[PDB]
Amino acid sequence: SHMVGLIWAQATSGVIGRGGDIPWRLPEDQAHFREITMGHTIVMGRRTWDSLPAKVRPLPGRRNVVLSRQADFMASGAEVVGSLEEALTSPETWVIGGGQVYALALPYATRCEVTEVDIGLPREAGDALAPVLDETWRGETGEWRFSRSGLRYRLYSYHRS
Numbered sequence: 001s002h003m004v005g006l007i008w009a010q011a012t013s014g015v016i017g018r019g020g021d022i023p024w025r026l027p028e029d030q031a032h033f034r035e036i037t038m039g040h041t042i043v044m045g046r047r048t049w050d051s052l053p054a055k056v057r058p059l060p061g062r063r064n065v066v067l068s069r070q071a072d073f074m075a076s077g078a079e080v081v082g083s084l085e086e087a088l089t090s091p092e093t094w095v096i097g098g099g100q101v102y103a104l105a106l107p108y109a110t111r112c113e114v115t116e117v118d119i120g121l122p123r124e125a126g127d128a129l130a131p132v133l134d135e136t137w138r139g140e141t142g143e144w145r146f147s148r149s150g151l152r153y154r155l156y157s158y159h160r161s
């Protein structure tokens, strides 16, 4: 189909999750995730889907796609696909996690929307980590700003052909 993006929020070290939680509290990043994904397709792995609250999934106003090897998986209000390539048939897709799906998706992706949270969390065994980019990606790293709580963050908007 077409435009494949990745979206995530990471500490400066690349930690995106620890102990099965987002490792900070940042409502403005929830607003940012909505504004990027709203009206488009989101793709997630089955474990990510399983971790969302029952009354929160599917995320509203977006086509939710769950990748699973299980043909009988129940993702009420979403659709389930059994290959990544089938999950990218939409005109605009944002891959939202987790690490297994980001690995599969990275070769197809031509945009990354990232939030860096200014927090010092050196990586530990078991952490969920950010996809690793390289020098063929280009774009803007925004200015630091404070959240309402005083937590600082900035935005990356990168692209490649």
Ligand SMILES: Nc1ncnc2c1ncn2[C@@H]1O[C@H](COP(=O)(O)OP(=O)(O)O)[C@@H](O)[C@H]1OP(=O)(O)O
Binding pocket: 044, 045, 046, 047, 048, 049, 067, 068, 069, 070, 073, 082, 083, 084, 097, 098, 099, 100, 101, 102, 104
């Ligand atoms: N090549 C592939 N084909 C189909 N489904 C896949 C896949 N790779 C990953 N998945 C699914 O995506 C799941 C992992 O989800 P995730 O990426 O959210 O997890 P994690 O955050 O642990 O990396 C896999 O366990 C698998 O779902 P099932 O266990 O239900 O089969």
